[PDB]
């Protein structure tokens, strides 16, 4: 009985309730210092821990995305996590930063200080 445009939207809402059931996802915005734990397909022993600031969040459906920037050993790394991914286990907000934009892309051109965490 479902009309078709409805179908396309509906499938995303189903996917996301299905994923938010197994693993509730936090309120997460730009300017959020964040810690993430990945279950890596290799190494059962330790789930990888990525800290860092959130420079962007692109909302789309089941594939909604978060971009974490962090300075590591002097090399700036940005990583992109699908939020509802099964391979993510725990995600939490460590701290919140006060920011006036929707995307901090200007953190590449700034000093390392601003990307430094933990």
């Amino acid at each position: 009985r479902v009309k078709l445009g409805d179908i396309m939207g509906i499938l995303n809402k189903k996917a996301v309730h299905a994923a938010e059931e197994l693993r509730p996802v936090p309120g997460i915005r730009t300017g959020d210092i964040v810690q993430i734990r990945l279950e890596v397909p290799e190494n059962k022993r330790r789930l990888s821990v990525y800290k860092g600031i959130v420079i962007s969040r692109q909302n789309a459906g089941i594939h909604t995305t978060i971009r974490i920037r962090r300075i590591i050993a002097g090399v700036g790394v940005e990583i992109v996590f699908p939020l509802y991914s099964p391979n993510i286990k725990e995600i939490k907000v460590v701290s919140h930063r006060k920011v006036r934009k929707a995307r901090l892309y200007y953190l590449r051109d700034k000093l390392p200080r601003l990307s430094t965490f933990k």
Binding site: L4, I7, A19, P41, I62, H63, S85, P86, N87
Partner: peptide, 16 residues
């Protein structure tokens, strides 16, 4: 059939 458009779909091992 009718094409309704594309989305992303996970697998248990986290293959999109």
């Amino acid at each position: 059939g009718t094409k309704l458009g594309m989305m992303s779909f996970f697998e248990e091992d986290g293959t999109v």
